[PDB]
Design a binder for this molecule. Structure first.
Ligand SMILES: OC[C@H]1O[C@@H](O)[C@H](O)[C@@H](O)[C@H]1O
Length: 390
């Protein structure tokens, strides 16, 4: 199993595309397996994952862990990878293992890295403008009002990509309602008409007046650019996005704080911290060689190689002393590890059709964040949920 492999990739942005290419360079060197990467625009790759897997997919592919893995593993679209994990199993922890498995208990994913969803800011700006890190909702709101009166956009905000605003719902839910409630909702074991969801949208109505206007017309990269260019005070997203988008020259000025506490019952106990990894499509060619590349991917060595170029994510291997780490990465390890539990992200944690319904409903909330809209959102979400989860 040394013959050439094909690798489908959603790393279409410059910085993560380059990081992946560097991993494949090293993967070919050590395994001997020639690899040809086929890249597709990020969103359209996940938007067409079904036809992709059912058609003539590549030997291996970039994908996501948790429910977003299970949903397509359940369809028989993926080759199980228990043989690979027999070799690499000792390298990963229980949390990474359960995220890597289908509903059937079998492995389908090799994971590579983790990252946090947190509020990013520029240290020099907080310093020079006398902004203090906010521990609580009230302090957060006060700070955003101070930014506003300073002539700044308080929170840079983008939702043209559809998924980014799901992160705000997640974190509001996790802060107000907690983790167990959030996963219930994702599994539709609690309805979208539930008063806890109303509370989420109600909190968001206060937050919305400090979020960048025109957000439904904005790519997340342009939001991250406004932060990096100091036109905005902070931005809530994943480090995989914001810190990958920063110049390497500017990255040392980047820092974050976890989303402030709202409800003392849940403090800052929880966050979204997505794991990314790789699958082996059932209809891909050369599975023998592909597993050899996967076995390599699932090592500390490979994660270290990878993190010489990726400076924004955090490796998952147990022994990992990949000493490249900057301050963003170190704080990521610590703050993630502090959480009692970590969810993935809405579109990774629920049925894709349900996430797609929410993506649109939340865009419509962004444009008209009134109690009227919130009522329609809950009823529409709950109606579509009853169909999807039947
Ligand atoms: O950070 C969370 C996001 O991660 C992205 O890479 C993915 O395209 C989104 O669908 C969402 O899961």
């Amino acid at each position: 199993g040394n013959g050439p492999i094909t690798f489908g990739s959603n790393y279409s942005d410059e910085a993560p595309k380059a990081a992946f290419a560097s991993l494949m360079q090293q993967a070919t060197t050590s395994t001997t397996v020639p690899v040809t990467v086929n890249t597709t625009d990020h969103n359209t790759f996940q938007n067409n994952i079904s036809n992709y897997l059912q058609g003539t997919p590549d030997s291996l592919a970039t994908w996501f862990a948790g429910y977003r893995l299970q949903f397509f593993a359940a369809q028989g679209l993926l080759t199980p990878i228990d043989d690979v994990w027999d070799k690499i199993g000792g390298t990963f922890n229980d949390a990474a293992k359960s995220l890597s498995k289908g509903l059937d208990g079998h492995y389908y994913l090799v994971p590579l890295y983790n990252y946090p969803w947190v509020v990013f800011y520029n240290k020099s700006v907080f310093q020079s403008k006398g902004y203090e890190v906010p521990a609580s909702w009230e302090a957060f709101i006060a700070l955003a009002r101070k930014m506003q009166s300073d002539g700044l956009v308080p929170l840079a905000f983008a939702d043209k990509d559809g998924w980014p605003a799901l992160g705000t719902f997640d974190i509001l839910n996790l802060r107000i309602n907690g983790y167990d409630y959030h996963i219930k909702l994702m599994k539709h074991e609690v309805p979208w008409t539930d008063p806890g969801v109303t509370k989420v949208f109600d909190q968001w109505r206060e937050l919305a007046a400090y979020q960048q206007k025109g957000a439904n017309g904005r790519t997340w990269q342009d939001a991250a650019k406004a932060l990096e260019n100091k036109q905005a005070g902070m931005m809530f997203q994943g480090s995989n996005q914001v810190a990958a988008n920063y110049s390497a020259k500017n990255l040392p000025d980047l820092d974050f704080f976890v989303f402030p506490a709202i409800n003392p019952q849940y403090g800052t106990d929880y966050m979204d911290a997505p794991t990314d990894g790789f699958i082996l499509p059932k209809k891909g060619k050369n599975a023998a060689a592909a597993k050899k590349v996967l076995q390599y991917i699932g090592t500390a060595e490979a994660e270290a190689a990878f993190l010489k170029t990726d400076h924004w994510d955090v490796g998952l291997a147990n022994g990992l002393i990949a000493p490249t780490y900057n301050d963003i990465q170190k704080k990521s390890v610590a703050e993630i590890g502090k959480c009692k539990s970590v969810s993935q992200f809405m579109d990774r944690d629920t049925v894709p059709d349900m996430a797609n319904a929410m993506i649109k409903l939340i865009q419509q909330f962004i444009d008209q964040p009134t109690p009227e809209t919130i009522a329609t959102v809950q009823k529409s979400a709950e109606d579509q949920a009853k169909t999807i989860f039947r």
